[PDB]
RNA sequence: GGAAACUGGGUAUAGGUGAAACACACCUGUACCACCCACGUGGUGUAGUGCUCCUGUAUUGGUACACUUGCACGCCAGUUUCC
């Protein structure tokens, strides 16, 4: 069979100075052929622990690894800011090798209501037969938010993508760009384009909106 | 560092295609260590792919690439290879190259990693982005809280690099992860928050470079016309 | 090539070591099996010589001629050094 590596939690929200533990359970025995990696955005992984619990050179000593049978736990004795990242786990007991799916680690803060901004399409773009309507949710935390597009109070669906920033380095917040894509032909057929946002910092949902062809 | 791994030759490949990756080593000889390929699709986790064991030549493959890939090495040129055949978009990932340590010091851990090179499996044509202004609101705020950006749409492959006033502007800037839209082209936007008091004078320019197609664009980003 | 050290029946298998997951090399165990004996908690390259020891064939105690046990060289094969 292929050995499975099952790594809880797959993300984790903690503060500087907390003890933390990522766990990685094995479908079969791997003796001690476990290794733990740390990866940061845009960057290769870096080794942290090799075999059971041995600490690859230069890695700080707040990093430890342990073992009970087929269950392995990376541990950080108190988080430092340079430690928030994703962490993987590998077995190399036998081929094919197997990586855990990672545990992203993120910084707990208090709730930040988003600042909501809506952008119509450029008239330059409308020269190309397409409209794009952009909605900005700015410096919010926690990460979960709701973005519904109502067009002449008709709720939309499946004509809009989105993406989220990584947690901000300074104030540890998130931001989001939702993009409604229309055809110019359909875009021009309607007036009130709106963006309605639900979040924990919002006592009631926030609508930013405009009218197609006002100033 | 002295020890380095440098992948090359990943790029754009249409499905059913054939790329070959090179991992070239410096500061150590690959013939005394085991060399590994490990891929990572965007936003996804890591995936061991294949490896090659020293002195034996013994190769090993993850079940998801069995039959399509081949890992090989060249001592004369201190380079590992990864021949890829029968490619498909599922295979779109950054393809890192790594090395197992020495048993006495780092067990079987992977202590040295290339940069990763990017394979994009897609039938899309290399294409330059189009950049459109996200203008500040006419209402904005009477106090200085305003928001603007650029929309960078329909380019291929990844990546782009966006800057504001050629690096001058960094504070309050978010450039969001690109989104692969159903046409197979990418699109992302970049924003920044600036004082509303600054709009009437300060000229904001986003700097867009899409390297894969030799494309730099700058858009001045003004307040909406008739917004006085 | 020169000399320097070791090593020695078969198949498996566990562990170690060699820049070493497998392979290859080496080292150490284990199990089993094939053979020698004088039959063991035994032994194990060798149709060689010498001493030895066991068992015979007997002949002219002596002597041959075998068989066996051990020891020492030699020879053979492998390994590791060092020029």
The C-alpha of A138 sits at a distance from chain B's nearest C-alpha, in angstroms, of 9
Q: Are residues A119 and A205 in the same domain?
A: yes
B132 with A122: Cβ contact below 8 A: yes
Q: Is B153 on the interface with A (CB under 8 A)?
A: yes
Give the containing element (helix H, strand E) for A49. Answer: strand A45-50
Of A33, A118, A163, the CB nearest to B188: A163
The one-character DSSP state at B198 is G
- What DSSP string runs through B54-76? TTT--EEE-TTTTTTEEEEEETT
CATH number of the structural domain B130-221: 2.60.40.10
Q: Are residues A129 and A186 in the same domain?
A: yes
Q: Are residues A18 and A103 in the same domain?
A: yes
- Considering the segment(s) B4-121 as one domain, its CATH architecture is Sandwich (2.60)
**A36, A53 Cβ separation under 8 angstroms:** no
User: Residues contacting strand C at CB < 7 A?
Assistant: A 33, 92-95, 97; B 29, 32-34, 51, 53-56, 58, 100-104, 108
- At a CB cut-off of 8 Å and minimum separation 6, what does A78 contact? A16, A17, A18, A19, A62
Resolution of the structure, angstroms: 3.0
Residue position matching structure tokens 């090799």: A50
CA separation (Å) from A138 to A160, A176, B63, B174? Answer: 18, 7, 43, 9
For A:142-201, CB contacts with B below 8 A are 161-165, 168, 175-177, 179, 181
Delimit the CATH 2.60.40.10 region(s) of chain B.
Answer: 4-121, 130-221
CA atoms within 13 A on the CB side of B131: 22
Flag whether A215 is in a domain: no
Q: Are residues A94 and A29 in the same domain?
A: yes
């Amino acid at each position: 069979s292929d050995i499975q590596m099952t790594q809880s939690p797959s993300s984790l929200s903690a503060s500087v100075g907390d003890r933390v533990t990522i766990t990685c359970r094995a479908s079969q025995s791997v003796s001690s052929a476990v290794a733990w990696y740390q990866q940061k955005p845009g960057k290769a992984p870096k080794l942290l622990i090799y075999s059971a619990s041995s600490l690859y050179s230069g890695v700080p000593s707040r990093f430890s690894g342990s073992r009970s049978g087929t269950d392995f736990t990376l541990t950080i004795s108190s988080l430092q800011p340079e430690d928030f990242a994703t962490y993987y786990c590998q077995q190399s007991y036998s081929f094919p090798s197997t990586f855990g799916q990672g545990t992203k680690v993120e910084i707990k803060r208090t709730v930040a209501a988003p600042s909501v901004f809506i952008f119509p399409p450029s008239d330059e773009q409308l020269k190309s037969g397409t409209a794009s309507v952009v909605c900005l949710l700015n410096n919010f935390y926690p990460r979960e938010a709701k973005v519904q597009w109502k067009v002449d109070n008709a709720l939309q669906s499946g004509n809009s993508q989105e993406s989220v920033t990584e947690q901000d380095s300074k104030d540890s917040t998130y931001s989001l760009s939702s993009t409604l894509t229309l055809s110019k032909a359909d875009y021009e057929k309607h007036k009130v384009y709106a963006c309605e946002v639900t979040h924990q910092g919002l006592s009631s949902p926030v609508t930013k909106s405009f009218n197609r062809g006002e100033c | 560092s002295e020890v380095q791994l440098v992948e090359s030759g990943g790029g754009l490949v249409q499905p059913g295609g054939s790329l070959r990756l090179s991992c070239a080593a410096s500061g150590f000889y690959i013939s005394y260590s085991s060399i590994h390929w490990v891929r990572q699709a965007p936003g996804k986790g890591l995936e061991w792919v294949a490896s090659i064991s020293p002195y034996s030549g013994s190769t090993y493959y993850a079940d998801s690439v069995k039959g399509r890939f081949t890992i090989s090495a060249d001592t004369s040129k201190n380079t590992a290879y990864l021949q890829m055949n029968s490619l498909r978009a599922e295979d779109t990932a950054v393809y890192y190259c790594a090395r197992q340590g020495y048993r006495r010091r780092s067990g079987r851990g992977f202590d040295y990693w290339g940069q990763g090179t990017l394979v994009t499996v897609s039938s899309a044509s290399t294409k330059g982005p189009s950049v459109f202004p996200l203008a500040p609101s006419s209402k904005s705020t009477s106090g200085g809280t305003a928001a603007l950006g650029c929309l960078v749409k329909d380019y291929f492959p990844e990546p782009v690099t966006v800057s504001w006033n050629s690096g001058a502007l960094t504070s309050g800037v978010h450039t969001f992860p690109a989104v692969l839209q159903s046409s197979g082209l990418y699109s992302l936007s970049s924003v920044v928050t600036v004082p509303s008091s600054s709009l009437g004078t300060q000229t904001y320019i986003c700097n867009v470079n899409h390297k894969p197609s030799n494309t730099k664009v700058d858009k001045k980003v003004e307040p909406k016309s008739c917004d006085k």
